[PDB]
Amino acid sequence: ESADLRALAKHLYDSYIKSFPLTKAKARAILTGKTTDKSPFVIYDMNSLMMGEDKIKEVAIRIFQGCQFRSVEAVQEITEYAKSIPGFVNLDLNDQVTLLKYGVHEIIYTMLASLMNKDGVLISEGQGFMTREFLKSLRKPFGDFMEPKFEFAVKFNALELDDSDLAIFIAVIILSGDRPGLLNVKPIEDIQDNLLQALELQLKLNHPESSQLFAKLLQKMTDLRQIVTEHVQLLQVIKKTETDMSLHPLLQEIYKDL
Numbered sequence: 001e002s003a004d005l006r007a008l009a010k011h012l013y014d015s016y017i018k019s020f021p022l023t024k025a026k027a028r029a030i031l032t033g034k035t036t037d038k039s040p041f042v043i044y045d046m047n048s049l050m051m052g053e054d055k056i057k058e059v060a061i062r063i064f065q066g067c068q069f070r071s072v073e074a075v076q077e078i079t080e081y082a083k084s085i086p087g088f089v090n091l092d093l094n095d096q097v098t099l100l101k102y103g104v105h106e107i108i109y110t111m112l113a114s115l116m117n118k119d120g121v122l123i124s125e126g127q128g129f130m131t132r133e134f135l136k137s138l139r140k141p142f143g144d145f146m147e148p149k150f151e152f153a154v155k156f157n158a159l160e161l162d163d164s165d166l167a168i169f170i171a172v173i174i175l176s177g178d179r180p181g182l183l184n185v186k187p188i189e190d191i192q193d194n195l196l197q198a199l200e201l202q203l204k205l206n207h208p209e210s211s212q213l214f215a216k217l218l219q220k221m222t223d224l225r226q227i228v229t230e231h232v233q234l235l236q237v238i239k240k241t242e243t244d245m246s247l248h249p250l251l252q253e254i255y256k257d258l
C-alpha cells in the first residue's frame with residue numbers, strides 16, 4: 001500500500017531533521033547569499049584562516065584535524081539516524097556495527113554535498129565557508145583530500161534532491177546487505193527493499209518530471225564507492241607521512257583496509 005510507504009517517508013524525514021542539525025535546505029539558504037539572515041565568513045587564503053578564529057601547528061594539518069573532528073560528529077549523527085530506521089535496531093548487533101562501519105563514509109559524502117557548490121564548502125555549522133581553491137592549494141599530502149568530493153558533489157547536486165529525498169536515500173545506503181561480513185543478509189534486504197520502495201514512491205511524487213531519477217540516484221552509488229576507497233588510501237599515506245599525527249578512535253575503528 002502506497003500509504004504505508006508515504007508514512008515511512010514521513011517517519012525517516014522527521015527523524016532526519018532531528019538527527020542532522022545542518023540540513024540541505026539550511027545549507028542552500030546560507031550558500032545562496034541573498035537570504036542573508038546570517039552569511040558565512042569566507043576562508044580563501046591563509047590570511048582569512050586566521051581571521052576565521054576572530055569570528056567563527058601547521059595550516060593544512062590543523063585544517064585536517066578540524067575536518068577530522070567534524071567526521072566524528074557526523075558519524076555520531078548518522079549512528080543516531082540509523083537507530084530510527086525501523087528494523088535496524090533489531091538486526092544482529094554485529095551486523096548493525098558492520099552496516100555503520102561501511103555505510104558511514106558513503107553517507108558523509110552524500111551529505112557533504114549539501115554543504116558544497118562548485119566554489120567551496122560550508123564549515124562550522126554553516127558559520128564559515130572554505131573555498132575549493134584554498135583547499136586544493138594545501139600541501140601535497142593534503143592538497144587533494146577534498147577535490148574528488150567537490151567533483152562528486154557538483155554531479156550529485158545536479159539531481160536537485162531535497163532533505164526528504166535524502167532521508168530515504170541515506171537509509172537505503174545503511175541497509176545494504178553486500179557489506180563485507182554480514183552474518184544475516186536476508187533481513188537487511190527486506191528492510192532495504194522497503195526503503196527502496198519508499199524512495200521509489202518519494203522520487204516519483206516529489207519530482208514528477210525528473211525521469212528515471214530513482215535509477216539515476218542508485219547509479220550514483222558507484223561514485224560514492226570510489227570516493228571512499230580513494231579516501232582511505234590517502235589516509236594511510238598521511239599515517240606514514242606524519243607518525244606524530246593522531247586519528248580519532250571512532251574513525252580508526254571504521255578504518256579497516258582491504
Ligand SMILES: *c1ccc([N+](=O)[O-])cc1C(=O)Nc1ccccc1
Nearest residue numbers: 064067068070071074108112145251
Ligand atoms: C576530512 C579530512 C579527514 C577526514 N577523516 O580522517 O575521516 C574526514 C574529513 C571530512 O570529510 N570531514 C567532514 C565531514 C562532514 C562534514 C564536513 C567535514
Ligand SMILES: CCCCCCCCC(=O)O
Nearest residue numbers: 066067070123124125126
Ligand atoms: C559542518 C561543520 C564542518 C566543520 C569542519 C571544518 C573543515 C570541514 C571540511 O573541510 O570539510
